[PDB]
Amino acid sequence: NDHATAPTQYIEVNGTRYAYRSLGAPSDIPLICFQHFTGTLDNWDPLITNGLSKGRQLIIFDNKGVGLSSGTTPDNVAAMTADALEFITALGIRYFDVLGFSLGGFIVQYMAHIQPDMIRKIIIVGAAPQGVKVLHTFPDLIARAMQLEPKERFLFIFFEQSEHSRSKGLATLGRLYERTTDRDQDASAQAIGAQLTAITNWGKKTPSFEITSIQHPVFVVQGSNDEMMDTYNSYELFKQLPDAILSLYPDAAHGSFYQYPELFVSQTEYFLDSY
Amino acid sequence: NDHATAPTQYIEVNGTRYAYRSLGAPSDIPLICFQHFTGTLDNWDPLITNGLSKGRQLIIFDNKGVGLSSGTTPDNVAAMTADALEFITALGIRYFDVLGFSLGGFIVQYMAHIQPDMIRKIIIVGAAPQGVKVLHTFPDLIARAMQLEPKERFLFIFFEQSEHSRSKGLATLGRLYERTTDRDQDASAQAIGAQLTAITNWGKKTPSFEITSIQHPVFVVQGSNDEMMDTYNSYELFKQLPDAILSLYPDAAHGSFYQYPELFVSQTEYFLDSY
Numbered sequence: 001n002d003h004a005t006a007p008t009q010y011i012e013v014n015g016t017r018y019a020y021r022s023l024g025a026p027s028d029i030p031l032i033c034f035q036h037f038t039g040t041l042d043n044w045d046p047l048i049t050n051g052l053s054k055g056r057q058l059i060i061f062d063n064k065g066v067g068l069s070s071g072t073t074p075d076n077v078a079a080m081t082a083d084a085l086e087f088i089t090a091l092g093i094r095y096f097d098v099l100g101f102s103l104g105g106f107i108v109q110y111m112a113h114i115q116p117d118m119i120r121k122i123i124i125v126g127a128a129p130q131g132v133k134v135l136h137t138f139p140d141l142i143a144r145a146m147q148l149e150p151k152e153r154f155l156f157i158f159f160e161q162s163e164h165s166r167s168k169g170l171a172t173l174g175r176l177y178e179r180t181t182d183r184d185q186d187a188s189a190q191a192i193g194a195q196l197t198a199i200t201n202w203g204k205k206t207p208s209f210e211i212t213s214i215q216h217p218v219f220v221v222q223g224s225n226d227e228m229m230d231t232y233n234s235y236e237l238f239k240q241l242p243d244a245i246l247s248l249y250p251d252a253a254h255g256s257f258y259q260y261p262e263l264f265v266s267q268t269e270y271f272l273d274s275y
Numbered sequence: 276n277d278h279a280t281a282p283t284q285y286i287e288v289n290g291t292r293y294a295y296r297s298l299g300a301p302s303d304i305p306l307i308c309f310q311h312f313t314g315t316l317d318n319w320d321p322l323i324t325n326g327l328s329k330g331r332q333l334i335i336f337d338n339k340g341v342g343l344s345s346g347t348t349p350d351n352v353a354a355m356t357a358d359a360l361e362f363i364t365a366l367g368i369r370y371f372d373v374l375g376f377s378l379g380g381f382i383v384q385y386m387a388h389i390q391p392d393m394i395r396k397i398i399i400v401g402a403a404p405q406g407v408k409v410l411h412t413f414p415d416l417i418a419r420a421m422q423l424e425p426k427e428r429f430l431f432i433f434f435e436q437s438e439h440s441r442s443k444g445l446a447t448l449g450r451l452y453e454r455t456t457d458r459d460q461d462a463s464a465q466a467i468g469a470q471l472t473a474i475t476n477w478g479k480k481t482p483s484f485e486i487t488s489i490q491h492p493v494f495v496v497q498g499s500n501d502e503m504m505d506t507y508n509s510y511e512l513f514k515q516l517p518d519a520i521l522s523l524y525p526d527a528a529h530g531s532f533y534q535y536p537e538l539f540v541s542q543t544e545y546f547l548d549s550y
């Protein structure tokens with residue numbers, strides 16, 4: 001099954017119903033994907049999920065409380081990580097690669113810290129380490145974005161100011177139209193508030209683990225100017241991690257991999273299959 | 276023909292005999308490669324030249340005075356660029372991609388400035404823009420390397436200090452053994468002195484053109500700690516260029532692409548064929 005056709009599946013775990021999809025053929029080391037702020041199953045780019053599922057099983061899921069997943073979204077990354085782990089382990093998956101975008105990129109760092117032996121390789125897109133000052137103003141970034149209707153809100157959050165970047169943003173919106181049937185619910189107000197809290201506190205709280213201690217192979221992707229996360233913080237990830245490859249994409253922003261999805265797939269497929 | 280079997284060819288141009296090799300099948304947009312400090316035809320990594328010549332014609336050459344090319348190597352990048360252009364145009368090649376490593380990475384920047392319409396895409400490995408302070412001390416870096424016999428000199432210049440990096444350096448030395456037959460001459464003392472002068476002055480002289488004016492697609496590759504060029508100067512290239520992709524490779528140095536040749540080929544092949 002591809003992105004458009006994979007059915008939404010459900011699994012009950014410790015009193016929570018998790019909604020998920022499995023793309024591609026089943027494989028021994030699946031890639032588990034962790035979504036951005038407010039995103040649901042339908043915010044994944046089909047070019048990326050189709051492209052990466054050619055070579056491995058790919059799992060996309062709604063964490064607790066998000067979209068068609070039941071329950072209450074917790075207010076912190078550590079709890080989101082524990083919740084994700086209960087889900088993944090309920091599926092019987094013991095060893096896997098991870099791809100985290102934005103908030104999801106915080107979760108994969110924390111997961112690698114607490115459960116190193118369950119993760120093989122890590123992809124971080126559009127994120128930052130714990131403690132970064134830029135996230136102290138995340139609520140004000142969202143207050144600015146709140147004023148915008150959907151297309152402008154999407155371009156504001158994810159794209160650069162140029163016609164070149166914005167047109168690739170309109171292309172991404174169209175790709176998100178491709179799922180016609182059995183679509184996810186929107187995130188929910190409760191989930192959005194919990195995530196806003198969690199993202200802000202990832203920046204405000206003193207780091208709780210050393211980035212240098214994550215020994216896994218990592219592939220870090222970012223655009224030239226991610227306003228939310230600060231592009232330089234991806235260079236910081238690369239400096240502090242012992243085995244990270246960095247890719248920076250031109251004239252791009254927080255939604256770098258939406259801007260250049262085929263470049264991302266090409267790079268990521270090599271990383272997972274061969275690095 | 277592959278790296279090991281391609282014959283050394285010669286072409287007489289304006290009183291100079293240029294030595295070169297052509298790998299792969301002839302193609303409409305060849306990739307012209309520009310070598311590092313003291314390097315000859317035999318310093319190219321066969322994994323890289325074989326890998327990239329699967330999908331395009333690849334030309335490696337000795338610039339004026341270097342190795343089996345005749346004449347006097349000039350003392351500056353601008354002249355090396357003019358010389359390269361007389362060579363490339365003598366072959367009948369009017370439009371081409373370029374790959375420049377180290378000194379060669381300075382030449383491809385200058386070439387894109389003076390002859391933009393002859394270049395399609397640009398790859399820069401292990402280099403820096405004009406004017407960078409780190410190159411003011413290039414002569415002292417070479418004075419330190421001068422004290423070392425061949426294996427240690429090679430690891431000092433090209434690799435990081437770890438066993439992981441140094442072992443990939445020993446692997447590179449073995450790959451450079453693969454060419455058994457019809458090998459190039461060494462650079463020559465005159466060529467080495469001219470290049471040392473040229474590299475130092477690329478840093479000492481005020482910039483003569485704006486990096487921002489190079490509009491071509493560029494792919495910039497560097498390791499985590501290039502002592503010669505400063506890794507941050509590759510981030511500077513990425514910031515200043517309008518259409519550059521950056522890749523930084525972990526626990527690596529000035530010889531980044533020797534450390535991870537298959538990663539480099541994978542990334543570069545996509546860039547040339549698809550970006």
Ligand SMILES: [Cl-]
Binds near residue numbers: 102103
């Ligand atoms: Cl986000």
Ligand SMILES: [Cl-]
Binds near residue numbers: 016070071072073
């Ligand atoms: Cl709950």
Ligand SMILES: [Cl-]
Binds near residue numbers: 114115116117118
């Ligand atoms: Cl573990």
Ligand SMILES: [Cl-]
Binds near residue numbers: 131
């Ligand atoms: Cl910070």
Ligand SMILES: [Cl-]
Binds near residue numbers: 208210
């Ligand atoms: Cl720690």
Ligand SMILES: [Cl-]
Binds near residue numbers: 264
């Ligand atoms: Cl793309």
Ligand SMILES: [Cl-]
Binds near residue numbers: 312313378
């Ligand atoms: Cl060099």
Ligand SMILES: [Cl-]
Binds near residue numbers: 291347348
């Ligand atoms: Cl001459």
Ligand SMILES: [Cl-]
Binds near residue numbers: 389390391392393
């Ligand atoms: Cl021109």
Ligand SMILES: [Cl-]
Binds near residue numbers: 406407408409
């Ligand atoms: Cl400088």
Ligand SMILES: [Cl-]
Binds near residue numbers: 483485488
């Ligand atoms: Cl200029």
Ligand SMILES: [Cl-]
Binds near residue numbers: 535539
């Ligand atoms: Cl490699």
